[PDB]
Design a binder for this molecule. Sequence first.
Ligand SMILES: *Cc1c(COP(=O)(O)O)cnc(C)c1O
Ligand SMILES: *Cc1c(COP(=O)(O)O)cnc(C)c1O
Lengths: 388, 388
Amino acid sequence: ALSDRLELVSASEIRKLFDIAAGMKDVISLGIGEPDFDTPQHIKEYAKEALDKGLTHYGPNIGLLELREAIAEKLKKQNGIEADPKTEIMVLLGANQAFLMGLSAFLKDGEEVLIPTPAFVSYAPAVILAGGKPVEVPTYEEDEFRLNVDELKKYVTDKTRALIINSPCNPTGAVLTKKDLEEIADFVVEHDLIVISDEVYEHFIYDDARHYSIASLDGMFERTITVNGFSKTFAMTGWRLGFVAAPSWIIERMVKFQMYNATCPVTFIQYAAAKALKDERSWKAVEEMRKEYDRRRKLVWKRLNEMGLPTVKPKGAFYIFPRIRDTGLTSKKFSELMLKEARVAVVPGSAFGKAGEGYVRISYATAYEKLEEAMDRMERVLKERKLV
Amino acid sequence: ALSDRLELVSASEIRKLFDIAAGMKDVISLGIGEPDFDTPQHIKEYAKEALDKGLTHYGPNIGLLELREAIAEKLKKQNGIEADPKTEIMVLLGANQAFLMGLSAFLKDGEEVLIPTPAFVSYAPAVILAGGKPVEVPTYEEDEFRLNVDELKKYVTDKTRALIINSPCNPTGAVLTKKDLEEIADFVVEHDLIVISDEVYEHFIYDDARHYSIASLDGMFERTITVNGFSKTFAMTGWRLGFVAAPSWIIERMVKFQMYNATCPVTFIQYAAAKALKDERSWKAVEEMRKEYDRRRKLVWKRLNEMGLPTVKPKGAFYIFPRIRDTGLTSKKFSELMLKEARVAVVPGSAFGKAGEGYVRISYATAYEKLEEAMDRMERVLKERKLV
Ligand SMILES: *Cc1c(COP(=O)(O)O)cnc(C)c1O
Ligand SMILES: *Cc1c(COP(=O)(O)O)cnc(C)c1O
């Protein structure tokens, strides 16, 4: 029963870190997994307008047609994904819902789900809740944390049914290249898996990174659940609005699940988001947020490497995953040390899976000036403790 | 696995009825399961205010503390329920989430959940999805559809772990009296069950009906999940905001579930509801809505009985459950006939359980004028077809 599955999901480390940052005040948090920016004013105005229009009643379980149609245009133009808004696109209460509900559309007892790690915290638990078995597949610092298909091959079994990829990746900042995805696509077809692609950080890419969607590749739409949303893109985490594009058989099953879950997303919020997707100011806003993230990104990368922590320059999202294993401490000891002595909160890498151990996640979705001081604080402690 | 449980849930009849009203245009729908009223303007203004204050980021999985504190006050004053906002109250994306997540905090494999019927459509599927077995407990029109402990005693087994109660009841409009609840409480305690009390229609009570909460009864809070929300009370169905009050051990397991589900409710929306609870204009609006519902309620009750369909006078919610079995037609055939010839949509009682067969649900959450016309159309065909 779900209760048994829930008991199997272990308590969150990020959770434990919050409650420990609570009794402290002088702490600069680098463990924040959301934009520090507020929602663009024009999006707020569209929401107000929707309220004035009285869009306060139930909407379809699949979401507002107008939004689904707006999503179809976005998926096609930006991601090369051709999806029917009437049957293949579903709006959700945040993209987070897509994992539990998407997996529940097909996952059977004991079936395995490959999860490249370090990975987003919701993956493994969603697999366990759906009735499956999470199988962590390590990604390496040497590959700039880009999933290597040769690693995937070590973990496949007759029970493997799905694969969850996340690019740009939380917590590494790794961006899968077109060829990475092409090889991954072949592997998925070879073992007849369903692949869930988490693309919420798509617009926050840097250097020569470019966002490709696996579902756009030849023969992939039939076996891919593309997950995305407005939380990171438009700084709308508190608005709880995400979506998926998948074959209609999967969509039908997710809407049925929704009928006995959250029912439907917020009506006036969907209206705001549909209008936002067609508003030029939305793209201007995203671009300026991307530019600021990039500025902070270069700061933390330089600082971390120069203070003595070998750190891969992330090409996407707003996280950096410095190596702390050489200090001789575990990811937890490191975080515990930084919090009490540097008054800086960083998430231990182990919270993102076994392969995360030896690292720590730092989010640069915080004021540049706070980042500057957080870096100085960490470096001082590293120097005083002779850890570097 | 969840996918297996999902396949066990049948396709919704209400769903089948919408798509069949779609290709038709002269139809008055009496199948509306939500308020026809708009959300009170001042609540809309509070939401707009929250947007201006930038309450657009993630909030706690359990919900904003300010809203939980406002709900604690509401539960104490209005329901006589003493609950700690910090650990015993959780905000959700609609009250609908409470059933799947609430049952998942404890229900084991094959464990039974007594469900009084005619019942709300989300009850049995939530039990199935949680991993248990739904056991229908009929309620009778001669009892004004008030749940009878005589019936519960016949359906309990050693496998029974929970009981779901709904007063005011959707679809019957029945309201459990204080003594009913006291007797139900005894039964729940005797069989060591957890009772989930769905009180979303609490404020729409009529005649001498008074709303009591089972969790307020002696020693009941420890084994009760009180489910409520803002969807019906304030006309906020499209806002997706409900809540539960329960023992902290249940609440803890529910927030953990949420972490891998919707994460947290809409931030600025929770701010709006917290303000609304303390605003006299909100309660003034509830009173006006209840007054209008009552006016419509008396019309439909009188019209239904006089046209030849024996109908129990509902004391709560905004639904009326006429008996149609005397016409010789099944609930589905009666709904088919009314849609085809009267151009009036009513939902077959069978969609709410076996005990619902022989009845039909009519919602009076629609304009008085539309109700008058629908009654006229229905009576015309009942007479034309010699069904009365
Ligand atoms: C933030 C995030 C999501 C989804 O967030 P929602 O707020 O639920 O839309 C999904 N995946 C990753 C890796 C994220 O960081
Ligand atoms: C409308 C309703 C609910 C909950 O609705 P939400 O919109 O999810 O808050 C719960 N129970 C019954 C019987 C209802 O009619």
